[PDB]
Design a protein around this motif. Structure first.
Motif, PDB file in Angstrom:
ATOM      1  N   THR A 119     -24.124  51.712 -14.351  1.00 16.23           N
ATOM      2  CA  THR A 119     -24.122  51.343 -12.937  1.00 16.23           C
ATOM      3  C   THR A 119     -24.378  52.539 -12.027  1.00 16.23           C
ATOM      4  O   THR A 119     -24.742  52.331 -10.875  1.00 16.23           O
TER       5      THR A 119
ATOM      6  N   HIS B 132     -13.045  50.033  -8.481  1.00 17.50           N
ATOM      7  CA  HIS B 132     -14.396  50.043  -9.085  1.00 17.50           C
ATOM      8  C   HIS B 132     -15.535  50.213  -8.106  1.00 17.50           C
ATOM      9  O   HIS B 132     -15.370  49.990  -6.915  1.00 17.50           O
ATOM     10  N   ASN B 133     -16.721  50.548  -8.643  1.00 14.31           N
ATOM     11  CA  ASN B 133     -17.990  50.605  -7.910  1.00 14.31           C
ATOM     12  C   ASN B 133     -17.990  51.537  -6.693  1.00 14.31           C
ATOM     13  O   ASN B 133     -18.399  51.153  -5.595  1.00 14.31           O
TER      14      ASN B 133
HETATM   15  C1  LIG Z   1     -19.337  46.057  -9.476  1.00 15.53           C
HETATM   16  O1  LIG Z   1     -20.649  46.347  -9.971  1.00 15.53           O
HETATM   17  C2  LIG Z   1     -21.084  45.475 -11.030  1.00 15.53           C
HETATM   18  C3  LIG Z   1     -22.431  45.984 -11.496  1.00 15.53           C
HETATM   19  O2  LIG Z   1     -23.333  46.175 -10.413  1.00 15.53           O
HETATM   20  C4  LIG Z   1     -21.114  44.024 -10.549  1.00 15.53           C
HETATM   21  O3  LIG Z   1     -21.414  43.165 -11.645  1.00 15.53           O
HETATM   22  C5  LIG Z   1     -19.776  43.622  -9.925  1.00 15.53           C
HETATM   23  O4  LIG Z   1     -19.913  42.344  -9.312  1.00 15.53           O
HETATM   24  C6  LIG Z   1     -19.344  44.650  -8.878  1.00 15.53           C
HETATM   25  N1  LIG Z   1     -18.154  44.211  -8.156  1.00 15.53           N
HETATM   26  C7  LIG Z   1     -16.871  44.370  -8.572  1.00 15.53           C
HETATM   27  C8  LIG Z   1     -15.817  44.056  -7.553  1.00 15.53           C
HETATM   28  O5  LIG Z   1     -16.583  44.742  -9.708  1.00 15.53           O
END
Ligand SMILES: *[C@@H]1O[C@H](CO)[C@@H](O)[C@H](O)[C@H]1NC(C)=O
Ligand SMILES: *[C@@H]1O[C@H](CO)[C@@H](O)[C@H](O)[C@H]1NC(C)=O
Ligand SMILES: *[C@@H]1O[C@H](CO)[C@@H](O)[C@H](O)[C@H]1NC(C)=O
Ligand SMILES: *[C@@H]1O[C@H](CO)[C@@H](O)[C@H](O)[C@H]1NC(C)=O
Ligand SMILES: [Hg+2]
Ligand SMILES: [Hg+2]
Length: 172
Positions: free
Chosen positions: A27, A53-54
């Motif tokens: 990612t 995350h992210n």
């Molecule tokens: C985090 O990123 C992934 C990959 O882009 C995505 O599938 C996911 O929906 C995102 N959101 C969360 C809250 O994890």
């Protein structure tokens, strides 16, 4: 045993909370792991299993932390996210003609990042000798020895990446 203990404020209980950054190479995003025992609540953004995350590299993110064991105000935690792990490469700079008596290792910055470099620290361990610098050079080494040189990169004293290099003091 007697009177119920006064609940602290969550800002009090979590004022010194620590975080570990875990990079996802797929990612290109970081996960911040909150170093707490109990299952904490985060407002607004979720923090399932005490993980945020992210997170984009080199961007500040804020998370308001609370738990039933503590009262308002919430602990506002600023996540100073490090640069992407793939932006650094551990390079062996040893000159082949002097490989029997020297070790040169250097971290290369392969792509630009916006994080301030003054908060970036490079550490090396060769044998049991510990170095703090982007590059290290050892000279007058005795030939025919083998060392495992471990290295890590810290951002605000947070380890976010690391690598190892096995070096022999010979020509092959
Ligand atoms: C985090 O990123 C992934 C990959 O882009 C995505 O599938 C996911 O929906 C995102 N959101 C969360 C809250 O994890
Ligand atoms: C990001 O967070 C750090 C730590 O709280 C802070 O000192 C710095 O000013 C922030 N960066 C920006 C652009 O505000
Ligand atoms: C820079 O990084 C160091 C960690 O090496 C951190 O402790 C400090 O607060 C930061 N200072 C500034 C001015 O960003
Ligand atoms: C790198 O970090 C992991 C934990 O994140 C650790 O298990 C490993 O020993 C570290 N050392 C090196 C040099 O890979
Ligand atoms: Hg390289
Ligand atoms: Hg790249």
């Amino acid at each position: 045993t007697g009177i119920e203990g006064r609940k602290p404020t969550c800002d009090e209980k979590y004022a010194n909370i620590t975080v570990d950054y875990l990079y996802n190479k797929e990612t290109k995003l970081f996960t911040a792991k909150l170093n707490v025992n109990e299952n904490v609540e985060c407002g607004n953004n979720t923090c399932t299993n005490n993980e945020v995350h992210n997170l984009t590299e080199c961007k500040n993110a804020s998370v308001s932390i609370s738990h039933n064991s503590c009262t308002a105000p919430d602990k506002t935690l600023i996540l100073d996210v490090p640069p992407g792990v793939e932006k650094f490469q551990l390079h062996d700079c040893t000159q082949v003609e002097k490989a029997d008596t020297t070790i040169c290792l250097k971290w290369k910055n392969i792509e630009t990042f916006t994080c301030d470099t003054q908060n970036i620290t490079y550490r090396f361990q060769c044998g049991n000798m510990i170095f703090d610098n982007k590059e290290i050079k050892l000279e007058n080494l005795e030939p025919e020895h083998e060392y495992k040189c471990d290295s890590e990169i810290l951002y605000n004293n947070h380890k976010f990446t690391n690598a190892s290099k096995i070096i022999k003091t010979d020509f092959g």
